[PDB]
Curated annotation (Swiss-Prot), chains A, B:
Belongs to the cationic peptide 01 (latrotoxin) family. 03 (alpha-latrotoxin) subfamily. Presynaptic neurotoxin that causes massive release of neurotransmitters from vertebrate (but not invertebrate) nerve terminals and endocrine cells via a complex mechanism involving activation of receptor(s) and toxin insertion into the plasma membrane with subsequent pore formation. Binds to neurexin-1-alpha (NRXN1) in a calcium dependent manner, adhesion G protein-coupled receptor L1 (ADGRL1, also termed latrophilin-1 and calcium-independent receptor of latrotoxin (CIRL)), and receptor-type tyrosine-protein phosphatase S (PTPRS), also termed PTP sigma. Expressed in venom gland, cephalothorax, and abdomen tissues from both males and females. The H8 helix is predicted to insert into membranes and form pores by assembling into tetramers. The helix is contained within a helical bundle domain that undergoes significant conformational changes during pore formation to allow exposure of the H8 transmembrane helix and transition of the toxin from a soluble monomer to a transmembrane tetramer. Is the main neurotoxin responsible for the human envenomation syndrome known as latrodectism that results from bites by Latrodectus species. Anti-alpha-LTX monoclonal antibody 4C4.1 blocks neurotransmitter release induced by this protein by preventing tetramerization and ionophore activity once inserted into cell membranes. However, 4C4.1 is incapable of reversing pore formation. This is Alpha-latrotoxin-Lt1a. Is an essentiel tool for stimulating exocytosis and study its mechanisms. Its mutant LTXN4C, which is unable to insert into membranes and form pores, plays a key role in understanding the dual mode of action of the wild-type toxin. May be used to antagonize botulinum neurotoxin poisoning and attenuate the neuromuscular paralysis via synapse remodeling. It comes from Latrodectus tredecimguttatus. It is found in: Secreted; Target cell membrane. The chain holds residues 116 to 151 of 1401 of the full protein. Homotetramer in membranes. Processed by furin-like proteases at both the N- and C-termini. Coiled coil: none annotated.
Length: 36, 36
């Protein structure tokens, strides 16, 4: 039960990391756009 | 205590993800404000 929950939480943390990565990529592209 | 904490970590992670989505949506709208 612990292993299933911790692994499930681990997937959620990986999803959060991935959405943070695409978020920073998008806002960096937007920063390039606003500087342009 | 663990299962209460296990869902506590899960709910905190999912609410953090929701806050991240709200933040990115609002800042994209506000960058659109910036360009206009």
């Amino acid at each position: 039960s612990h292993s299933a929950a911790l692994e499930e939480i681990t997937k959620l943390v990986e999803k959060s990391i991935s959405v943070v990565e695409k978020t920073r990529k998008q806002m960096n592209k937007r920063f390039d756009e606003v500087m342009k």
